[PDB]
């Protein structure tokens, strides 16, 4: 049923399902088997930052992930998102753990979307920026194990009081309002997403990752989408 486009920060290589032999970024059209990837030098415990972009002229989805003091990693993939995704969509952040685990912690998240038409002065827009997550955050649809307000943060995966991550966990956060990505009289459509995070683990091998995703508006966590499926897909096809 559900329909997914996402940019994965895969902290654990499941090389039997096409993950490279290390931590990587990647771009998932309707399949966790990333159509493109590139190497990611994840840093256990540092605050990393993620920049997603597309426009309907270039029909290319490109992302850049960047720790301070450090080189960025970038990946891109040419796709017409209008030939993939429904005309109305919800955007979100997903992450997960299996028998390996990490903190999956959003410190900030900031979407922008524009439709500009043939007409004079006719942009249509939605921005949001969260630098501080509330306990009762009514503009976010929290799903599965995702919680807010903990040091004013979004906790995609489960954490215990003391402050360390639980395995076999999946959670997502979706912005309450739909996003129009296409309109008949569109001449350029665009979107960018930024978000910062703190993946952290007591282990040399953390799993599984964080995705920023764009989905149908009724999208929900598919069964057994813990671990390698990142809360996005029900299987690995």
Ligand X SMILES: O=c1[nH]cc(F)c(=O)[nH]1
Residues binding Ca ion (CB under 5 A): 10, 12, 14, 19, 228
To Ca ion, the closest distance from the beta carbon of 173 in angstroms equals 20
To Ca ion, the closest distance from the beta carbon of 61 in angstroms equals 19
Among Ca ion, Mn ion, ligand X, none, partner that 12 touches (CB below 5 to 8 angstroms by kind) = Ca ion
**Binding residue ranges for Ca(2+):** 10, 12, 14, 19, 208
To Mn ion, the closest distance from the beta carbon of 215 in angstroms equals 18
Q: Which of residues 113-172 bind ligand X (CB under 6 A)?
A: 113-115, 124-126
Among Mn ion, Ca ion, ligand X, none, partner that 14 touches (CB below 5 to 8 angstroms by kind) = Ca ion
Residue 110 engages ligand X in binding (rule: CB under 6 A): no
Contact 172, 232 (CB under 8 A): no
Alpha-carbon distance of 29 to 56, in angstroms, equals: 16
Phi, psi (degrees; rounded to nearest 5) at 46 = -95, 165
The string of DSSP codes covering 23-51 is -EEEEEESSSS-SEEEE----TTS-EEEE
Whose CB is nearest to ligand X?
Answer: 113
**Binding residue ranges for Mn(2+):** 8, 10, 19, 24, 34
> How far from the centroid of its chain's Cα atoms is residue 24's Cα?
14
For 47, the token pair is 């605050």
Among Ca ion, ligand X, Mn ion, none, partner that 62 touches (CB below 5 to 8 angstroms by kind) = none
To Mn ion, the closest distance from the beta carbon of 14 in angstroms equals 8
Alpha-carbon distance of 38 to 27, in angstroms, equals: 10
Alpha-carbon distance of 157 to 186, in angstroms, equals: 37
Alpha-carbon distance of 137 to 134, in angstroms, equals: 5
Q: Find the discontinuities in the chain where C to next N exceeds 2.5 angstroms and give the residue preceding each.
A: none
Binding mask 13-42 for Mn ion (x = CB under 5 A): ------x------x-------x--------
Q: Which residues bind ligand X (CB under 6 A)?
A: 113-115, 124-126, 177, 179-180
């Amino acid at each position: 049923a559900d329909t997914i486009v996402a940019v994965e920060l895969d902290t654990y290589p499941n090389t039997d399902i096409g993950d490279p032999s290390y931590p990587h970024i990647g771009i998932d059209i309707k399949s966790v088997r990333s159509k493109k990837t590139a190497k990611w030098n994840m840093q256990n415990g540092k605050v990393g930052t993620a920049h997603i972009i597309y426009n309907s002229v270039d029909k290319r989805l490109s992302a850049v992930v960047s720790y301070p003091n450090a080189d960025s990693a970038t990946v891109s993939y040419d796709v017409d998102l209008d030939n993939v995704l429904p005309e109305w969509v919800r955007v979100g952040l997903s992450a997960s753990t299996g028998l390996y685990k990490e903190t999956n912690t959003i410190l900030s998240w900031s979407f922008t979307s524009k439709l500009k038409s043939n007409s004079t002065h006719e942009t249509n827009a939605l921005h949001f920026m969260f630098n501080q997550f509330s306990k009762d955050q009514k503009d976010l649809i929290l799903q599965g194990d995702a919680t807010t307000g903990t040091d004013g943060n979004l906790e995609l995966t489960r954490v215990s009081s003391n402050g360390s991550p639980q395995g076999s966990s999946v959670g997502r956060a979706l912005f309450y309002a739909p996003v129009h990505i296409w309109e008949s009289s569109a001449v350029v459509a665009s979107f960018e997403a930024t978000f910062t995070f703190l993946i952290k683990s007591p282990d040399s091998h953390p799993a599984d990752g964080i995705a920023f995703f764009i989905s149908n508006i009724d999208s929900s966590i598919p069964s057994g989408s813990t671990g390698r499926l990142l809360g996005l897909f029900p299987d690995a096809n």
